[PDB]
């Protein structure tokens, strides 16, 4: 009955208030899901459906929860006042995050970060979640677009992970301490670790550092490529060979002395590029002169053209 269930509702909520998620397994059967014959209001059913989602998230069963919220998404579109949309978006983003679908969750959180209904702190939290999910996402151009979009934002400058987004987008070298800080600030479910540990983030950061070091070096020794990536020299050679083989780098490995060669910058095209740069500097300097002193610049121009 309605009143009988309601009376136990507040008692169960107060009992759960002790921050006991172990009991969240049994609270699912305490909620009157289908015991009533009558069809309740759409808002009540949707709110119950949404509150079951975060409870099951603590129960670590997202596989069925995905389809469970997908089938309620159809009815979620209607009978929403204002907060149903916000709650549904937050729950969908969280369940996408928990299923290691980091790139889609990043887009969802980025979209959520602009809704004006929620508070500013919620917007910043959504932005932080989007940044973390983008960084943890899989390599590709899709994730690159999201990285550029987050970099163009400014609200991202006050996040703790900006120092790593800046190096991730601009192709810089992430040292050990920055990665350690980022991993420390991460959540346990985001720290995936396929097979023998080999944390996926730790492998992606190594493969990004090796790719970024290809623009600063002309040829690097194994013993100092390993000390730059913080790995043994044999591991550095193996990773370099793997990346050079398939499609991910340009260069070749000489194993006798031990050196991996990146691009060599042939002399004559380099000479042409430097000529281009010197002429570009001439043009920019002339524009600056013409802009910071127009009255003298006009007299100077009309002293050799009409000469």
């Amino acid at each position: 009955e309605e009143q009988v269930a309601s009376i136990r509702q507040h008692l169960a909520s107060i009992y759960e208030k002790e921050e006991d998620w172990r009991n969240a397994a049994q609270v699912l059967v305490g909620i009157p899901l289908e015991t009533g014959q009558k069809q309740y209001n759409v808002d009540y059913k949707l709110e119950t459906y949404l509150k079951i989602a975060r409870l099951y998230l603590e129960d670590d069963d997202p596989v069925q929860a995905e389809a469970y919220i997908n089938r309620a998404s159809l009815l979620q579109n209607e009978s929403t006042n204002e907060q149903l949309q916000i709650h549904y978006k937050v729950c969908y983003a969280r369940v996408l995050d928990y299923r290691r679908k980091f790139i889609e969750a990043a887009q969802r959180y980025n979209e959520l970060s602009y809704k004006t209904i929620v508070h500013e702190s919620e917007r910043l939290e959504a932005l932080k979640h989007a940044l973390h999910c983008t960084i943890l996402a899989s390599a590709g151009q899709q994730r690159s677009r999201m990285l550029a979009t987050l970099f163009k934002d400014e609200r991202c400058q006050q996040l703790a992970a900006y120092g790593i987004l800046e190096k991730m987008y601009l192709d810089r070298i992430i040292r050990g301490n920055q990665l350690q800080e980022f991993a420390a600030m991460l959540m346990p479910h985001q720290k995936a670790t396929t097979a023998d540990g080999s944390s996926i983030l730790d492998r992606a950061v190594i493969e990004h550092n090796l790719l970024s070091a290809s623009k600063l070096y002309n040829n690097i020794t194994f013993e100092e490529l390993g000390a730059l990536l913080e790995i043994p020299a044999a591991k550095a050679e193996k990773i370099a060979s793997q990346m050079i083989t398939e499609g991910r780098m340009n260069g070749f490995i000489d194993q006798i002395d031990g050196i991996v060669h990146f691009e060599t910058r042939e002399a004559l095209p380099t000479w042409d590029k430097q000529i281009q740069s010197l002429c570009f500097q001439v043009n920019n300097l002339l524009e600056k002169i013409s802009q910071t002193a127009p009255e003298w610049t006009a007299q100077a121009m009309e002293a050799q053209m009409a000469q």
Binding site: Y114, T116, R145, T149, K152, D153, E154, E287
Partner: protein, 102 residues
């Protein structure tokens, strides 16, 4: 659909128009363009200019939160003229309009 048949590796980047400084009409049209592509470029050419430089200006959309609503603004970009011997020769021949070592 038509142009994907001819040029296969070319992709949509943004839109262009003619006028002076960016205008609210332009920032309204940029929303419709951005509905298609995440980061579309904006190009503005001034056909009636008064300076001594090329009137082409390039902008990119940057969104911001202020006063309790989201406003989208334009950030200027610096461009460089691309290099190609065929394009350079054609451009020079078109610009000039009238011994082989002379």
């Amino acid at each position: 659909e038509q142009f994907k048949q001819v040029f296969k590796e070319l992709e949509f980047l943004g839109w262009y128009t003619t006028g002076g400084p960016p205008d609210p009409s332009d920032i309204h049209v940029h929303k419709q363009v951005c509905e298609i592509i995440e980061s579309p470029l904006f190009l503005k050419l001034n056909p009636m200019t008064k300076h001594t430089d090329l009137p082409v200006s390039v902008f990119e959309s940057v969104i911001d939160i202020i006063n309790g609503e989201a406003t989208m603004l334009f950030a200027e970009l610096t461009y460089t003229l691309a290099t190609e011997e065929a394009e350079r020769i054609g451009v020079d021949h078109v610009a000039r309009m009238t011994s082989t070592v002379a």
